[PDB]
Design a protein around this ligand. Structure first.
Ligand code: GLN
Ligand code: MG
Length: 460
């Protein structure tokens, strides 16, 4: 239904072999994670990855009940009261250069179709100084500005990453969608002004943690939540389903509307995300619903949708529910619900399942606990550990060991450096155990003390 097989086109190359290699740590930690299946003939699975990866797009939730519109409108009222309604479109120059929020537009990422087929980079189709598009691209941009997105096609391929061993064995590999470079520019033009403000003000009050640095913001998040009787964690990640097409329509006219200061073209841009054409090898699909991955606004849109969805689930479950009975902290598929009331998220799961949405506990458990506090929850693979008046993000041990077990040749040292800043919050003993496989074979790893000093100094 929601997946339409179009006529074939020219074969776009789809990477079929992983760039990930094992480290010396893998034989020590032996993680239940491994590189995703990228090939039909991978011996670690009995399934066909080409079929499994797209089966989520076959069906899609066509409608949503009135409560979703009400919550979207009410969340919009709170967001734009905090952030203001000066949300007009930016110029191409500003989109390329960025603003205070968001770093400048990346010039070495894929420029999408048809440029990749012709062997062109992003630097070929625009000049970063003066922001001038090449004729063909300017025509494409102008065409979109007249509400016509019929030309744009997403470059789709399998995501080369670590997956849980069960997802490896079921060939449940995720998909990357790269939009055309001019479609990204337009996207950043239309949503960038709002994105700058939204992503520089993470916290309970906004309802979003997007754009946070866990090292600093964990203290603020934790302090804001510690007074509540309980905090529940919710996971939205679901390989088998995607966002309702109707959800895009709700955001277009209740959230990202002209009334809240957005450009008239935003509704059309959001529609081009909602229903889009995707090129995968020679196959061409028209997919209904779902959020493309490579768009800059993806995680922002997902975050806002999931914030709306949890309260809608609560309204659907409890007739006496009111918006401010909870506070929400959303980041993509991860969500926290802080409250003084006892809530039964098993019942909320049942409610949301009626509208095609799956929620599960953030930990390994299959059912939600009735009792849960700040010290129990996981958020972005991190717990909240109290350290005087501060909170530190203690990352799950299996996540750390998995990260340390594989790498991409060329960038080992900078991967280890990034992991030291994650592992420091586990304490010196665990820090030294995690990096011991590397140090035993002669690798110099930064000391616990050096990284601990860096974090502590953030609050002096
Ligand atoms: N990519 C999407 O739009 C779907 C994401 C959503 N969190 C899910 O249930 O899979
Ligand atoms: Mg994958």
């Amino acid at each position: 239904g929601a997946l339409e097989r179009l006529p074939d086109g020219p074969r776009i190359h789809v990477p079929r072999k992983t760039a990930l290699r094992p480290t010396v740590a893998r034989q020590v930690f032996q993680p239940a994670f491994a590189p995703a299946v990228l090939s039909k003939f991978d011996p670690r699975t009995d399934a066909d990855v080409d079929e499994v990866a797209f089966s989520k797009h076959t069906s899609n939730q066509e409608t949503l009940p009135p409560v979703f519109r009400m919550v979207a409108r009410e969340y919009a009222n709170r967001v734009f009261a905090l952030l203001g309604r000066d949300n007009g479109r930016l110029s191409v120059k500003q989109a390329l250069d960025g603003l205070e929020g968001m770093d400048p537009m990346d010039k070495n990422t894929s420029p999408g179709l048809p440029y990749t087929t012709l062997g062109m980079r992003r630097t070929d189709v625009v000049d970063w100084e003066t922001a001038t598009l090449i004729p063909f691209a300017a025509e494409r941009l102008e065409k979109m500005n007249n509400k016509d997105f019929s030309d744009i096609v997403y470059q789709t391929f399998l995501k080369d990453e670590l997956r849980p061993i069960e997802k490896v064995q079921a060939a449940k590999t995720r998909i990357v969608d790269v939009p055309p470079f001019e479609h990204c520019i337009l996207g950043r033009q239309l949503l960038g002004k709002f994105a700058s403000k939204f992503q520089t003000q993470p916290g309970l009050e906004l309802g979003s943690a997007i754009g946070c640095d866990p090292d600093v913001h964990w203290t603020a998040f934790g302090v804001a939540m510690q007074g509540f009787e309980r905090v529940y964690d919710v996971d939205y990640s679901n390989f088998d389903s995607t966002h309702s097409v109707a959800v895009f329509r709700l955001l277009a006219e209740e959230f990202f509307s002209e009334e809240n200061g957005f450009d008239p073209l935003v509704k059309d841009y959001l529609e081009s995300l909602a229903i889009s054409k995707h090129a995968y090898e020679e196959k061409r699909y028209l997919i209904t619903g779902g959020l493309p991955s490579g768009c800059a606004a993806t995680s922002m849109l997902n975050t806002i949708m999931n914030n709306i969805i949890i309260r809608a689930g609560l309204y659907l479950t409890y007739k006496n529910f009111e918006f401010d009975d909870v506070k929400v902290l959303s980041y993509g598929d991860d969500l926290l619900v802080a409250t003084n009331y006892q809530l039964n998220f098993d019942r909320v799961r049942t409610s949301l399942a009626k509208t095609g949405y799956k929620i599960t506990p953030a930990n390994k458990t299959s059912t939600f606990p009735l009792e849960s506090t700040l010290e129990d929850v996981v958020f972005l693979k991190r717990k909240f550990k109290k350290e005087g008046p501060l909170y530190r993000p203690v990352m799950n041990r299996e996540a750390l060991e998995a990260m340390l077990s594989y790498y991409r040749p060329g960038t080992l040292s900078e991967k280890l450096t990034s992991i030291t800043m994650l592992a420091v919050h586990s304490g010196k003993q665990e820090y030294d155990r995690l990096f011991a496989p590397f140090r035993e074979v002669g690798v110099i790893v930064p000391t616990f003390e050096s990284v601990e000093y860096r974090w502590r100094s953030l609050f002096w």
